[PDB]
Amino acid sequence: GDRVADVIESSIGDSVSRALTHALPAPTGQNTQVSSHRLDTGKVPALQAAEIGASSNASDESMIETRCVLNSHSTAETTLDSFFSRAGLVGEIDLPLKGTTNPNGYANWDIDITGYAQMRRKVELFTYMRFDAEFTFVACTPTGEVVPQLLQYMFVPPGAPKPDSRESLAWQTATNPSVFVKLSDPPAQVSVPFMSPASAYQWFYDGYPTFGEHKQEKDLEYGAMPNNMMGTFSVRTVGTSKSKYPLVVRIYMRMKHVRAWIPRPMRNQNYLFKANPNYAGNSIKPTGASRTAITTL
């Protein structure tokens, strides 16, 4: 029995998020209203205090004389679907005849969008993201030529046997998905759900995954959360013998049904590595351009 008083008046057990703000609609920009001259004391919108860390609130009406303007300019193309749902390159897989990378007619690619910076710098504006996807595969020889060849793809989730060869038993794909496709056909294209254990893909993890005495030889696991490693993507030329033709495979990602959180700044230095925000130190270029004099253009 809760007979004391400090337990009755307690704030413990509050599953509610006190929100000061509340969203509003805005299918168009704001309509500028009319104003006239004012010569009063006290009222003074220009003088702000920015130490508080809030933005200004002065407007065209309260600083100068305006007219009425009925703005019909939409705000629909600044949304996230209309900003992210545009395909871009995320990977490349080579299957050459004789080389050093992948000569035996198979290749494994670790699913990771962070290898090309047009698409990485768009997502790295946000921290947590929750999105479906739509991959697309474009196969071609180095010359762009199109050849009559059969190909197999296989999504290898975590904990599953990675194939070690072209004639392996992991290619029966009884439970894993797969995509047979030819090059004479159009690009392959499939859809993807949100596959994480968590509730969002975080592009930035500040911590270590495991416990232990973190020595210097195990600092390569800084910034590694396994709730983003969504597995592996395998590919091979179907057959028992080697192929007559080299090949290259390009992978495009298109995001849809997006939700984002946590705005944060944007990269200004060139990328170097993956899963790693490192920058060159002796080559810190400014954020932008420069000139000769503050008093002159």
């Binding site: 809030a54 995954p209 944060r264």
Partner: protein
Amino acid sequence: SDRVAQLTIGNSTITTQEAANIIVGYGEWPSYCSDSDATAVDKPTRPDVSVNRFYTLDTKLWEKSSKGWYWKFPDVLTETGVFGQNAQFHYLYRSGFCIHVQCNASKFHQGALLVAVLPEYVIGTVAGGTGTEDTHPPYKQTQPGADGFELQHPYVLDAGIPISQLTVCPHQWINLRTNNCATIIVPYINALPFDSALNHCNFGLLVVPISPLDYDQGATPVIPITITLAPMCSEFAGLRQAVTQ
């Protein structure tokens, strides 16, 4: 009304005369977890006084050639009080924070700081300078403690991102003509309802002077900077033996 403020949580209390308004990070207050969002079945513990009070970390100095600092939360309190001695026992953790910063000066001094709160502030090394040499940051730069760690390249915040855009986060300034403190309140920012307190480090406080300190001789040169903070709505779960790290 907007200048004078007081902050009473726990046994402790803070006053201030030349302050500004209070900020709520990302527009909402802390909270305890819902029975829908949560996943673990064990009943937490919620002390409500012994942990939710103001702790004072360490007192820096602000010279003219200073560059900046950062602190990682909630790493700062893992060896301090009944808070820390719960966070070692348990495995799961949830909390908010109130954050108060001090720097006083007379009416002849001048300067400005920027007091920002950035979630998931990964640190990045310089790649040997040439760019090719892959490196990684050591343990004393990612969890430096309560004694803080000093920046080397503050224009990029040591992560390839400018400081010019750090105001989009919950920020405040300390312009010594106007104010002398900055109060910031923050909820629990993570994709998961509970998460560890020792491995993971949810956000980092930054303090970077933009306009440098300056004065004239005969005036007091020592201009400290003190950092005060309080947990709020703290929960714990997964009891077992104490783990330092």
